[PDB]
Design a protein around this ligand. Structure first.
Ligand SMILES: CCCCCCCCCCCCCCCCCC(=O)OC[C@H](COP(=O)([O-])OCC(O)COP(=O)([O-])OC[C@@H](COC(=O)CCCCCCCCCCCCCCCCC)OC(=O)CCCCCCCCCCCCCCCCC)OC(=O)CCCCCCCCCCCCCCCCC
Ligand SMILES: CCCCCCCCCCCCCCCCCC(=O)OC[C@H](COP(=O)([O-])OCC(O)COP(=O)([O-])OC[C@@H](COC(=O)CCCCCCCCCCCCCCCCC)OC(=O)CCCCCCCCCCCCCCCCC)OC(=O)CCCCCCCCCCCCCCCCC
Ligand code: BCL
Ligand code: BCL
Ligand code: BCL
Ligand code: BCL
Ligand SMILES: CC[C@H]1c2cc3[nH]c4c(c3C)C(=O)[C@H](C(=O)OC)c4c3nc(cc4[nH]c(cc(n2)[C@@H]1C)c(C(C)=O)c4C)[C@@H](C)[C@@H]3CCC(=O)OC/C=C(\C)CCC[C@H](C)CCC[C@H](C)CCCC(C)C
Ligand SMILES: CCCCCC/C=C\CCCCCCCCCC(=O)O[C@H](COC(=O)CCCCCCCCCCCCCCC)COP(=O)(O)OC[C@@H](O)CO
Ligand SMILES: COC(C)(C)C/C=C/C(C)=C/C=C/C(C)=C/C=C/C(C)=C/C=C\C=C(C)\C=C\C=C(C)\C=C\C=C(C)\C=C\CC(C)(C)OC
Ligand SMILES: [Ca+2]
Ligand SMILES: [Ca+2]
Ligand SMILES: [Ca+2]
Ligand SMILES: [Ca+2]
Ligand SMILES: [Ca+2]
Ligand SMILES: [Ca+2]
Ligand SMILES: [Ca+2]
Ligand SMILES: [Fe+3]
Lengths: 42, 318, 57, 255, 280, 56, 41, 43, 56, 58, 42, 56, 41, 57
């Protein structure tokens, strides 16, 4: 492969990446509900 | 007579250097290098290859959009007439939004294109900054270029972004155009009571002149000792040679003191960087802190006084 | 009609550079399109819908 | 209200504080070579007094050389080196006069430090500066004459020899020295490009620095296929000595 | 005092004028014939500047006399004196100081030539310094001469000479459009960029990241090829920097030399030759 | 009218460079045309059709 | 030639196309919500 | 032997895919202009 | 999503991507805040709940 | 009246370098000519033919 | 042969070049026929 | 002249063709731009009719 | 001097002149049409 | 009245470079002279002779 990761290392990285990204996106959603409740923009 | 080492009289060629190998994660370089005989008379004949990853690709895209938005509006301002675009090119510009819109996004028909060109050039430059940082990191080099570039970006940011926001209006930023941005320069000095009396303008001039002073001195010094390999500054710095010794003595004997082969580049680095640091501060203070630099200079006792040989009655008093 | 041997395009264009250029192009396009529309009648931020918040103060 | 102090005045004073701190920083960096100074105060003090001025010297930095080349420190204690000259007057500030034949004195514009006895290296670790015989991948750029076979003339137009090879920089491709087979002694000596003017139509290399007969004493290379830093400086300095020493008129003055 | 490697270079001779008479150092400074001559011009000029500050424009008792560093000003004569010598208190002092300065400047450059001869180095530095001297002489000699009065020179005052620049510039309405001025500024700006680029690269390859060895010529070339697709080379960057700095000075001299002697209207109107071409 | 041996053009012009240039040209041309039309009477963004959305 | 084998080009293409179509599906949904909220033609 | 590196069979195959892809692109171009002409005829 | 999308880390450096996302997101966050402050939605100078300069 | 040996032009000029140049020139000339025409009375975009679409909304 | 084509290769390219050029010129003529009918300029 | 053909023994036929082609295109553009700057302008002369008037 | 043999310079000149006359012939025709449509002198 | 040995001028000056200099100089001169003439009363393009073609519209 090109990045030097093995196949299982890419598998492990991908699983932690997707969980962390979903947690980040979850925070963004919470923030927009607070913002919509406080100051709806549409 | 003697060889002055201005032009390479006899160029040699070797297969193009692909560059120092970069660590994993960097993209392969692109381009097949070519040689220019005429570039090889004054310097290196190789053109290319180039590195282009995501940072530079994103940078170039932002930058091409910004440049095209400017040019499009220039061509539109002579009604698509290409001949009149060439006739008036130096006069044409893309104008900041009218003051009535403040810092709000203005209409496409009256300032929206300027704000978009300004946004995307700014992002393009910021991504180019990251590029300068990454290219040094991949070579294991320190970050002196990106630090100096940040100082130039600071000045650029003050002119078009920081000060207009502080002043509450995009109308106070710089238009995109050759002569139009010269109008802005002169009008800015007029409006703020003569920029000559801005002390950071004075300092910025001192450092801009000093950059030409220092590069003339250093440029000329190195060519005069290039007969001793003085242009090879890496090994003159680690292993002082008679090139570096004769250079220091020329200046020591001229003006009483001297630097080293390494430390002249520090003097040069700081002189150039301070040019744009002081310029940003000078503009940052104009309108925000000082409204009339001459009267500010009068107030602190700096403005020269002259015998009165002309004078005018103020018709607003009468 | 899609071609069955279209996959061989990745024998011609480098897949990594294509990915990098698409990401770059789309970030630019996304910012550019959002800004063009904000400079027109379609602007949804300064349209005072559902209300103007600068008037409540 | 009104106040004399304002932010422009505050900021400009802050700049002066920064700037004078910067100047002292720079002056410290400037003293990593050539210091402490050689004075007659240090002689008479029996070495107790080191002349360094203000600011004083910085703490030493280290340069790590690639390819296990060792460590360079700056500033560094350098052993005094004899000067092959005697004072024109015993008074302080007087010049000195080279001993013996000036060309061979190693003094004045003939002088040079003792650089390291190793070859500058390419990034890959090969000797950087080498003849085209060795770096067979090099060629002369189309449009320019091949210096090999050109005739080398001294300052007085006399034939000093023939260009026997061309020495190139493998890191950043360019001619650095011409190799001259000297007619008088058949030795092969380096000629720096910095001292060479090409007369292309005549296929002659003109060297204003020295006479044809001075080519016999160009310092010689220990190894004919590479050049050490030490040898580079000795070669260049010998040609440079001719600028002042090669003829009588060159001593000056004009009037 | 001498640099610890300096003594082996302090050779006798190489003077242009003077020979053994003035061939000596004073501390670090080499003197020589042009050292003696230059010192006299300099000390006189400086002391006459201070005397002008002492008496001011209208005598030491007037309210216009000041030692305030920004406000001290020694001014050239009225234009009515033409190319003649004015009285000392009516601009003649300025006129004598100008000659001292030219003599001080030219003596400095010739002293540098003698130093190059001692060191067996090229003459690039005094040659380059000649461009600065030429610009000063364009300002106080050639341009005033072509217009017929020494009073077209600029005054010797830290802030007062900016007033001269300001009012001379606005004689042409919008001096920014001077073509030699635009070209010169481009050189001044390009020089500053190039200087920061050069300084940065040398410091960044000799002071690499911690744990790294000193970098190589190959790193230097690769580094700017990686950023801009081109590397000019470590010799040529010094060639370039000298060309940019000297070009900035040359077009400066051109841009003020044509402002009055070879052009009297506004500078924007000069560009009407372009606008009026029969293409558009 | 097209030639039966037109496929031989790929023995002459590099397929890779041609494809990259086409998509680059078409993307730039498409941006340009959208720009021109917006700057004219044909503008579909600021035409208040179907309604003006800027409320008082 | 990019140095991929034929099977790698098959595998990359399938993931590329499936991923691109997923991105395109989001764009359509966004424009359906935008068209319902503020129709522009 | 060619100047691009492709054999004759490779160039025939690329041409086939190139022409099919380009006509598919042009087909998309045509539909947009019919929609645009029906929505906002410009001539 | 495809089952083998994880193979992206065989083609894209994981460490570089992670860092580039953080900087992209921080810049985006700064950019978007600045946009909203330039609109009617500005929440700092809206004098809600009250004007604090009007108290002094 | 062309020459029978005119094909020999591709013995002198590189067909590849020629083809790229024609494409670039034709693209630029096409862009150039379109702009010149738009700058005149011939403008087909701002002529409000068949109708003016901005009037419809103002 | 300065470009490197043989004599038969130069003959084959010319034939295909002239045909393609004429087909392009045919398109250019057809386009200008429509423009003169739509908006005559002389 | 009968020996004029020897000009191709002196001047490179390939660069002369390129210079002629390059010069002729620029000249053609230049001459059109010159004529369009004068009374002879055939594009903005409202002949046969003014099409902008047709749309008012 | 250019590399062309004498016969090559003869053959190139014959085609060059024939082509240039065709180009010059076209130029006259275009000028004739221009003069008929919009005489400029 | 020319000299019989004037042909020896080509033993001193390169005939190719002279040709290229002549061609370059003459083209430049012709462009310069036309634009000079077009900038005087003699202008033959904007003189409305035989007629003003803008006045036809
Ligand atoms: C709104 C802003 C918009 C900006 C947009 C920009 C867009 C980009 C954004 C991203 C920015 C990222 C920044 C960098 C990220 C990290 C980089 C990194 O690798 O860090 C590790 C980096 C490397 O570590 P290292 O081990 O040192 O490695 C060094 C190498 O080995 C080799 O090192 P070396 O051996 O070459 O040495 C390094 C060098 C260090 O130089 C630098 O690297 C930085 C250069 C400065 C750049 C900024 C200009 C500063 C302007 C100041 C003037 C302002 C006027 C007001 C004055 C206020 C101050 C009082 O050494 C020196 O030059 C010494 C300097 C001494 C300072 C002056 C001396 C006097 C100080 C005061 C004296 C006391 C006063 C009273 C005295 C009384 C008696 C008189 O850490 C450092 O130590 C270097 C710090 C430099 C990085 C940060 C600063 C520069 C970058 C930001 C510049 C921004 C300019 C904007 C200014 C705005 C106006 C004020
Ligand atoms: C303070 C200087 C006095 C120090 C001292 O004790 O010297 C005694 C020292 C003897 O002591 P020694 O026993 O030999 O000890 C060895 C020293 O310690 C040797 O110690 P060292 O090598 O450490 O001392 C060097 C010292 C000695 O050097 C000298 O002798 C000449 C001093 C000239 C100083 C020039 C300062 C220029 C300031 C201009 C004002 C504007 C400032 C900037 C404004 C803003 C610009 C941005 O020079 C300096 O310390 C000043 C150099 C740094 C100046 C920085 C100027 C920066 C301006 C801004 C540029 C932009 C930078 C961008 C970044 O030397 C002398 O006796 C000189 C004799 C005087 C001879 C005069 C007649 C010469 C006749 C021929 C010439 C005709 C003219
Ligand atoms: C009236 C007009 C509408 C509106 C109309 C639209 C429409 C219509 C669309 C968007 C789209 C987007 N809008 Mg908008 N938009 C509105 C207001 C906003 C505001 C705001 C402060 O008011 C913000 C910050 C955004 C932000 C965004 C982005 C999430 C997105 C552009 C992404 C991009 O360019 O990716 C470029 C980067 C890439 C393409 C990389 C591709 C790689 C993979 C496939 C993507 C991973 C990145 C990440 C997951 C993308 C997040 C998107 C998902 C919804 C999570 N909208 C208003 C209310 N907006 C677009 C969208 O949703 O796209 C699907 C879109 O088509
Ligand atoms: C009316 C408009 C609202 C408002 C609307 C929003 C909305 C809507 C959002 C934000 C978001 C953010 N806003 Mg805001 N914001 C307001 C006022 C402020 C003020 C202020 C001085 O008034 C500040 C300083 C901030 C600052 C911030 C950040 C905390 C955050 C963006 C981080 C980022 O870009 O991370 C990019 C960095 C990364 C991706 C790195 C990876 C993740 C790291 C580890 C997260 C770091 C910790 C994180 C910042 C903690 C904050 C979580 C809180 C739940 C907010 N807000 C007003 C009151 N703001 C965003 C947010 O909360 O995101 C969750 C968001 O969606
Ligand atoms: C009032 C003036 C007329 C008009 C008058 C003309 C005339 C007259 C002509 C064009 C031609 C063209 N016009 Mg127009 N044009 C109008 C409005 C438009 C608008 C618009 C937004 O309004 C657009 C985008 C275009 C676009 C175009 C291009 C499709 C084409 C030139 C391409 C080129 O330079 O190729 C250069 C590139 C190459 C030579 C490389 C090789 C070509 C490749 C193999 C083929 C590419 C596709 C090809 C151009 C298809 C043409 C098909 C139809 C005839 C349109 N027209 C208005 C309504 N247009 C030209 C044309 O049809 O050319 C045939 C032409 O002569
Ligand atoms: C009075 C005003 C007249 C007018 C007067 C003239 C006159 C008079 C002449 C031209 C000529 C030209 N005009 Mg005009 N022209 C008018 C309007 C136009 C318009 C327009 C948008 O209105 C356009 C785009 C053109 C375009 C052109 C070109 C077709 C041609 C220049 C080619 C060149 O430089 O070759 C230089 C390049 C080369 C020599 C390269 C070698 C050969 C190349 C590879 C093959 C080129 C094919 C050639 C163009 C075929 C066309 C001949 C037809 C008879 C037109 N005309 C109006 C109506 N035009 C010239 C011409 O017809 O030339 C024969 C010319 O002398
Ligand atoms: C040509 C490109 C640039 C350049 C290069 C240049 N200058 C140079 C050199 C070179 C190559 C030197 O070798 C030389 C040097 O030794 O530098 C350390 C020098 C130098 N350039 C200097 C200054 C300098 N150069 C400047 C500009 C430039 N120099 C260029 C833009 C400027 C500007 C822009 O204003 C100045 C301030 C000095 C540091 C030094 C020359 C030192 C010298 O000649 O010393 C003898 C003279 C004195 C010590 C003072 C004489 C006093 C007079 C007798 C009376 C004063 C009269 C004066 C006119 C009053 C001015 C008053 C007001 C204007 C404030
Ligand atoms: C001038 C153009 C030079 C050029 O275009 O050189 C090209 C390489 O470009 C490459 O690396 C990229 C070359 C980009 C660099 C060109 C110069 C950029 C500007 C440098 C000057 C400094 C900028 C200002 C800095 C202060 C040529 O290679 P290709 O295009 O690949 O074609 C060759 C094919 O046959 C491959 O088989
Ligand atoms: C038709 O043309 C084509 C397409 C063929 C291409 C040709 C293009 C041409 C010819 C372009 C010519 C360009 C020229 C001559 C440009 C000259 C430019 C000059 C001299 C510029 C000088 C100074 C400009 C400055 C300093 C501008 C600074 C602006 C800044 C920093 C603006 C920043 C704006 C921001 C960050 C906006 C953010 C938006 C927010 C977030 C606030 O939105 C709410
Ligand atoms: Ca303006
Ligand atoms: Ca809204
Ligand atoms: Ca609409
Ligand atoms: Ca609030
Ligand atoms: Ca229409
Ligand atoms: Ca007409
Ligand atoms: Ca006429
Ligand atoms: Fe240097």
């Amino acid at each position: 492969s090109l990045t030097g990761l093995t196949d299982d290392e890419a598998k492990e990285f991908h699983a932690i990446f997707m969980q962390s990204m979903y947690a980040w996106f979850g925070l963004v959603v919470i923030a927009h509900l607070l913002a919509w409740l406080y100051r709806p923009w549409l | 007579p003697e060889y002055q080492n201005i032009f390479t009289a006899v160029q040699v060629r070797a297969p193009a250097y692909p560059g120092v190998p970069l660590p994993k994660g960097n993209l392969p370089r692109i381009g097949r290098p070519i040689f220019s005989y005429w570039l090889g008379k004054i310097g290196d004949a190789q053109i290319g290859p180039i590195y282009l990853g995501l940072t530079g690709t994103l940078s170039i895209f932002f930058g091409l959009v910004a440049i095209s938005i400017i040019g499009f509006n220039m061509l539109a301002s002579v009604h698509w007439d290409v001949f009149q675009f060439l006739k008036h090119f130096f006069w044409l510009g893309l104008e900041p939004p009218p003051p009535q819109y403040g810092l709000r996004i203005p209409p496409l028909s009256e300032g929206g294109w300027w704000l978009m060109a300004g946004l995307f050039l700014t992002l393009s430059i910021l991504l180019w900054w990251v590029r300068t940082y990454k290219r040094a990191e991949a070579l294991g080099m320190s970050q002196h270029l990106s630090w100096a570039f940040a100082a130039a970006i600071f000045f650029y940011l003050v002119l078009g972004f920081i000060r207009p926001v502080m002043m509450g209006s995009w109308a106070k930023a710089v238009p995109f155009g050759i002569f139009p941005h010269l109008d802005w320069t002169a009008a800015f000095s007029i409006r703020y009571g003569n920029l000559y009396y801005n002390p950071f303008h004075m300092l910025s001039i001192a450092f801009l002149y000093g950059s030409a002073l220092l590069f003339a001195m250093h440029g000329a010094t190195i060519l005069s000792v290039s007969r001793f390999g003085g242009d090879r500054e890496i090994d003159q710095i680690t292993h002082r040679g008679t090139a570096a010794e004769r250079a220091a003595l020329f200046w020591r004997w001229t003006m009483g003191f001297n630097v080293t082969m390494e430390s002249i580049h520090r003097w040069a680095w700081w002189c150039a960087v301070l040019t744009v640091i002081t310029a940003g501060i000078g503009i940052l203070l104009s309108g925000t802190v000082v409204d009339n630099w001459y009267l500010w200079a009068v107030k602190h006792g700096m403005a020269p006084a002259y015998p009165e040989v002309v004078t005018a009655v103020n018709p607003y008093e009468t | 009609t899609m071609n069955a041997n279209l996959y061989k395009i990745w024998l011609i264009l480098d897949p990594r550079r294509v990915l990098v250029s698409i990401v770059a192009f789309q970030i630019v396009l996304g910012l550019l399109i959002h800004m063009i529309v904000l400079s027109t009648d379609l602007n949804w931020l300064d349209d005072n819908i559902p209300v103007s918040y600068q008037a409540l103060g | 209200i009104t106040h004399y102090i304002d932010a422009a005045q505050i900021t400009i004073w802050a700049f002066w504080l920064f700037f004078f701190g910067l100047i002292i920083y720079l002056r410290r960096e400037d003293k990593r070579e050539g210091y402490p100074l050689d004075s007659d105060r240090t002689e008479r003090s029996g070495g107790r007094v080191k002349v360094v001025g203000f600011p004083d010297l910085p703490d030493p930095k280290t340069f790590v050389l690639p390819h296990n080349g060792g460590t360079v420190v700056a500033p560094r204690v350098e052993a005094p080196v004899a000067v092959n000259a005697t004072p024109f007057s015993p008074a302080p500030g007087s010049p000195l006069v080279p001993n013996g034949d000036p060309m061979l004195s190693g003094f004045g514009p003939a002088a040079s430090p003792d650089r390291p006895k190793h070859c500058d290296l390419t990034f890959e670790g090969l000797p950087k500066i080498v003849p085209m015989r060795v770096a067979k991948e090099f060629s002369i750029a189309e449009g320019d004459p091949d210096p090999r076979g050109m005739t080398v003339v001294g300052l007085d137009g006399e034939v000093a020899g023939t260009v026997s090879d061309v020495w190139v920089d493998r890191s950043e491709p360019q001619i650095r020295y011409l190799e001259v087979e000297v007619a008088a002694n058949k030795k092969k000596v380096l000629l720096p490009i910095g001292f060479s003017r090409f007369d292309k139509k005549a296929r002659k290399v003109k060297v204003d620095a020295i006479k044809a007969a001075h080519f016999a004493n160009v310092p010689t290379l220990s190894n004919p296929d590479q050049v050490t830093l030490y040898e580079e400086d000795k070669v260049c300095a010998y040609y440079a000595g001719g600028k002042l020493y090669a003829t009588a008129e060159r001593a000056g003055p004009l009037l | 005092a001498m640099l610890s490697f300096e003594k082996k270079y302090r050779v006798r001779g190489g003077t242009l004028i003077g020979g053994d008479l003035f061939d000596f150092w004073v501390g670090p400074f080499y003197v020589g014939f042009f050292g003696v001559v230059g010192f006299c011009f300099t000390l006189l000029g400086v002391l006459l500047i201070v005397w002008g500050a002492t008496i001011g424009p209208t005598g030491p008792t007037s309210d216009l006399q000041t030692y305030n560093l920004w406000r001290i000003s020694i001014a050239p004569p009225d234009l009515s004196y033409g190319l003649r010598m004015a009285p000392l208190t009516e601009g003649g002092l300025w006129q004598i100081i100008t000659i001292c300065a030219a003599g001080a400047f030219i003596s400095w450059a010739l002293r540098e030539v003698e130093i190059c001869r001692k060191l067996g180095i090229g003459f690039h530095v005094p040659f380059a310094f000649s461009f600065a001297i030429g610009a000063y002489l364009v300002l106080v000699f050639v341009r005033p001469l072509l217009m017929g009065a020494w009073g077209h020179g600029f005054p010797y005052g830290i802030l007062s000479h900016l007033d001269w620049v300001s009012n001379v510039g606005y004689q042409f309405l919008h001096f920014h459009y001077n073509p030699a001025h635009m070209l010169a500024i481009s050189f001044f700006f390009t020089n500053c960029l190039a200087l920061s680029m050069h300084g940065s690269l040398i410091l960044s390859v000799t002071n690499p990241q911690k744990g790294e060895p000193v970098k190589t010529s190959e790193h230097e070339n690769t580094f700017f090829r990686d950023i801009v697709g081109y590397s000019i080379g470590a010799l040529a960057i010094h060639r370039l920097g000298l060309f940019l700095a000297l070009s900035a000075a040359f077009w400066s001299a051109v841009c003020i030399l044509i402002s009055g002697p070879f052009w009297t209207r506004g500078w924007p109107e000069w560009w009407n030759w372009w606008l009026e071409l029969p293409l558009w």
